[PDB]
Design a protein around this nucleic acid. Structure first.
Lengths: 80, 127, 113, 202, 60, 78, 155
RNA sequence: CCCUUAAGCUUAGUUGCCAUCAUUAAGUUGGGCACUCUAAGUUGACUGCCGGUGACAAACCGGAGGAAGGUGGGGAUGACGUCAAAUCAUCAUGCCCCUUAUGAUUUGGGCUACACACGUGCUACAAUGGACAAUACAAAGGGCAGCGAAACCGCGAGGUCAAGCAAUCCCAUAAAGUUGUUCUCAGUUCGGAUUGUAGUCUGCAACUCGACUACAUGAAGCUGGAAUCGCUAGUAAUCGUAGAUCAGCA
């Protein structure tokens, strides 16, 4: 089933992992617990000076949080 | 028994157990001299035994990985020190008048964006 | 000394030290060693009487010419002398190559700085 | 001579990364419609008190929270205003559905409406000073740790104009963790094109 | 053009690649990106206050 | 360059083969430098220039690996 | 650098030569940062020196430093009202740390074809006096051994 | 102060790191343990009286110090105002102008190419050094239009673009310090400049409208003027996997 987890903040994907685990925990299954993954990032650099000014440039990018979870008990107890 | 053979320096870690009985440090099914390129200092990576007054104490079953080779070594300045410190718990109050038991000296920094090479920036043509 | 014109130097290996004489040299010289027992010996003045005969009868039978085709330069120029390229728009116009004729340094066509 | 945007730094850290969603596959064109719907309460609503906006869509389940400005005068009667607002929103294909409402208060508490509001009542040949200082007091009378409002572009009645910034002491910007905020006033009338500056502590 | 070179680009000048990316609501041809479909000073306003997510100004 | 489709023009070489009825030579006039050529070129100029006219060009067994007006003057030294 | 008092900041360790001066000169001769290359030049090129030059460079390393290191220096130091230089006392970090580069600037001097053998030929006709390595030391050290100057200065 | 690395409780202790199990070509199949920061939500720190007093006027020194020098490198942080400049030209401008030409179609042409004198970023100017070769390490973009494995076309400006498809997982010789084939100081097997042959592949068309190149044309060259280049740790010496930008190429 290799269900996925994907985000951009460091508080919206821990919730993803934890809360799908719990949704499966609230009812009977030997479903899997929290399996966190590292914090990845998505860069984007570009000149800001309206003219030909450069080298006064500060790093500018974003953080793409990507987690993963397994559902290790397919059940009619807590599936959807 | 010596567990927690650990200790890292310059983005290149290893984990080096220590075995009760004799002593022979052995990374990646090789020796302290036949995995590092030539770098005549195979006995140096184990001077954490020659600042120790005894060297052949505990066999390893070590492992490696990393990016280069210079950072790969000189961390095992702890590959003995960490597990060795742990099993021999005498090793904090008698192991620093040489400078072994814990050291963790330097590491890396950010390649500056727009500059030639971090510290190196656009040079001046003339004036 | 014998392969084409003369080539004198010693103490070195004959395998690629052919670079002097036009068309071919060193690189191809050590890559064209397609004969019966011809090879670099580091004794350019020894060990050689008849081997050169066969490994030269090739160079005459090597219809790909070398020096003999030094003139394919001149003759491909001859085709182009209608102001086209490499002879008219590169020799009759007195310009440089690299298609940076002049933004960097240039000694071979313009030898005067 | 630089105090850069804290609209542009204090995001996610305390005030949170506003634009919200991932989308597994549709990446460029669910945003090809987002500026036009997120800025739809400032373009088809005529830049009216919008304090901040948002986008939220995966799962093909869009909703978007919004102040709805100061509500009641735009809404009116029985709700036959915002139904046509939704008529104007989704009918692209299904774009910007269910754009909900939590009401907002105190026009003179927060810089966002104040910005284009004081891009309005200075330039009317009235001693723009007399009203500059007016909404300066009215929003430094509440009790925030100040609002430093000042006109930077084209004061006066004579030709050659400067950036005279008439601020009032203290309104921080270097409380890196807390939020300081810039809501801007890009307007004009009869005379050139004007510039004003605003900085609040909440 | 710039204020009239919008259709020429994002209409079909009849080859695969004669579309050269330009800021969505602008005309600047240099400094652009497809999956952002915009530019430098025709795009920046967004990651101020959050209209683009997870964009911290520094500290990778 | 490549093999497999020298890029004989559709319009241009149509103008040739159907204007190559007789020996009458009306060659290009095309002020265009993009063509590609056959063995059946028959005595005529080209116009491989666009200043304010149309430029006579090489006709007989000219440059043989090319697909354009390689010999056509527009400028020189000064 | 408002302050100063900086040391060598290194615990000179050696491989299998047992010395504290054969590890502080391995980085000076280290051509374009070559550890093993210089390590093989200090265990096979510095050990075969006797075969080529004459004597080995193992315990004769003190004769290639003590019999070449100068004392009086040449640094401008205004004092009183004129303009005369004053020599600094040859200290361990200002005589052995700077007086041990007699193998990097002299490696490209010996004109004996083989540069590797020319680098090992720096121990011959240089360990004593009147050589090609102490020729620049006699034009410096011997310049203030009799002509005394200010003694109540700061340096 | 929130953050980039940091003994760390750990935790993803599955694709993770491999003492415990030898079921481990990167399909870390594995315990679904760890063995340890490690894969961050990083968490600590600090003048900490400090061992001292300056005779005291606070501080700071340092006894070695918590795993990181006195704010933890310190990332981000940017006094008034000087600067008629930074934009009328990539952007938005108050301002008036050619108006079947200054726009305009592809273009002829052209911000590379002369008749020259200087600024440019490194590889130039052999006795551990090329044309040349068996060939250790992966960082980190990636990739829904991409990279090519172990094997490999190794002649480049890649290709079948075939298999794992966000820690991994593809560019894998990444280039050197690892044995160093090869050319004993003649412009000499150092050369990739022109007088030469021209080429990897994606173009609606290389004559003046870039390349670097291998087929190797063997030139600039042998330490430096009135005229020039990193600097107390891995930053640079040298390159380095590649490519954002985009149908060629840093």
């Amino acid at each position: 089933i290799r269900i996925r987890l994907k985000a951009y903040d460091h508080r919206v994907i821990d919730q993803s992992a934890e809360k799908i685990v719990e949704t499966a925990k609230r009812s009977g299954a030997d479903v899997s617990g929290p399996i966190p993954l590292p914090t990845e990032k998505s860069v984007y650099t570009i000149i800001r000076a309206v003219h030909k000014y450069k080298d006064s440039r500060e790093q500018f990018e974003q953080r793409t949080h990507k987690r993963l979870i397994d559902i290790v008990n397919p059940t009619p107890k807590t599936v959807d | 028994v010596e567990y927690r053979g650990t200790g890292r320096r310059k983005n290149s870690v290893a984990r080096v157990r220590l075995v009760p009985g004799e002593g022979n440090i052995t990374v990646n099914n090789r020796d302290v001299r036949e995995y590092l390129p030539f770098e005549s200092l195979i006995l140096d990576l184990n001077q954490p035994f020659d600042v120790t007054e005894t060297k052949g104490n505990y066999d390893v079953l070590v492992n490696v990985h990393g990016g280069g080779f210079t950072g790969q070594a000189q961390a095992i300045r702890h590959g003995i020190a960490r597990a060795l410190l742990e099993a021999d718990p005498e090793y904090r109050g008698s192991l620093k008048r040489a400078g072994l038991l814990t050291r963790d000296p330097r590491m890396k920094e950010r390649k500056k964006p727009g500059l030639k090479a971090a510290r190196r920036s656009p040079q001046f043509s003339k004036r | 000394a014998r392969i084409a014109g003369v080539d004198i130097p010693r103490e070195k290996r004959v395998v690629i030290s052919l670079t002097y004489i036009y068309g071919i040299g060193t690189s191809t010289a050590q890559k064209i060693l397609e004969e019966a027992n011809v090879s670099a010996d580091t004794r350019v003045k020894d060990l050689t009487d008849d081997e050169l005969g066969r490994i030269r009868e090739v160079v005459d039978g090597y219809k790909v010419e070398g020096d003999l085709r030094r003139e394919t330069n001149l003759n491909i120029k001859r085709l182009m002398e209608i102001s086209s390229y490499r002879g008219i728009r590169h020799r009759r116009g007195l310009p440089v190559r690299g298609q940076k004729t002049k933004n960097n340094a240039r000694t071979r066509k313009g030898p005067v700085k | 001579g630089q105090k850069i945007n804290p609209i542009g730094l204090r995001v996610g850290i305390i005030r949170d990364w506003e634009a919200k969603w991932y989308a597994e596959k549709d990446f460029a064109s669910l945003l090809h419609e987002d500026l036009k719907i997120r800025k739809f309460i400032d373009n088809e609503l005529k830049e009216a008190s919008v304090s901040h906006v948002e986008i939220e869509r995966a799962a093909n389940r869009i909703n978007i929270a919004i102040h709805t400005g100061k509500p009641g005068m735009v809404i009116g009667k029985g709700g036959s205003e915002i139904e046509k607002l939704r008529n104007k929103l989704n009918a692209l294909t299904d774009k910007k559905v269910h754009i909900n409402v939590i009401e907002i208060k105190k026009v003179d508490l927060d810089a966002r409406l104040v910005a284009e509001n004081i891009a309005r009542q200075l330039e009317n040949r009235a001693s723009f000073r007399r009203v500059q200082k007016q909404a300066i007091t009215r929003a430094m009378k509440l009790g925030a740790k100040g609002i430093k409002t000042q006109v930077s572009g084209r004061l006066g009645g004579a030709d050659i104009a400067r950036a005279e910034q008439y601020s009032e002491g203290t309104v921080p910007l270097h409380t890196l963790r807390a939020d300081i905020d810039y809501a801007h006033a890009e307007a004009d009338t009869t005379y050139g094109k004007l510039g004003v500056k605003v900085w609040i502590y909440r | 053009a710039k204020t009239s070179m919008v259709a020429k680009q994002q209409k079909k000048q009849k080859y695969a690649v004669r579309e050269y990316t330009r800021c969505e609501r602008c005309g600047r041809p240099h400094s652009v990106y497809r999956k952002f479909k915009l530019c430098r000073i025709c795009f920046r306003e967004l990651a101020y206050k959050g209209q683009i997510p997870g964009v911290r100004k520094a500290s990778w | 360059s490549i093999k497999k489709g020298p890029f004989v023009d559709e319009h241009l070489m149509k103008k040739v083969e159907a204007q190559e009825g007789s020996e009458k030579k009306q060659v290009i006039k095309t002020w265009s430098r993009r063509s590609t050529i056959f063995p059946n070129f028959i005595g005529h100029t080209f116009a491989v220039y666009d200043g304010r006219k149309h430029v006579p060009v090489y006709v007989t067994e000219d440059m043989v690996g090319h697909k354009l007006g390689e010999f056509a003057p527009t400028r020189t030294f000064k | 650098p408002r302050k100063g008092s900086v040391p060598k900041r290194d615990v000179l360790p050696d491989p299998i030569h047992n010395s504290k001066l054969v590890t502080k000169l391995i980085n000076k001769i280290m051509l374009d940062g070559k550890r093993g290359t210089a390590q093989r030049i200090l265990y096979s090129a510095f050990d075969l020196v006797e075969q080529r030059s004459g004597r080995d460079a193992l315990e004769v390393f003190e004769e290639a430093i003590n019999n070449i290191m100068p004392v009086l220096e040449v640094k401008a130091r205004r004092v009183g009202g004129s303009n005369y230089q004053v020599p600094v006392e040859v200290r361990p970090e200002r005589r052995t740390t700077l007086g041990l580069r007699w193998l990097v600037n002299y490696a490209r001097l010996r004109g004996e074809k083989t540069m590797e053998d020319r680098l090992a030929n720096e121990i011959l006709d240089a360990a004593n006096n009147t050589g090609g390595a102490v020729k620049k030391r006699e034009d410096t050290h011997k310049m203030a051994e009799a002509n005394k100057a200010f003694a109540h200065y700061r340096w």
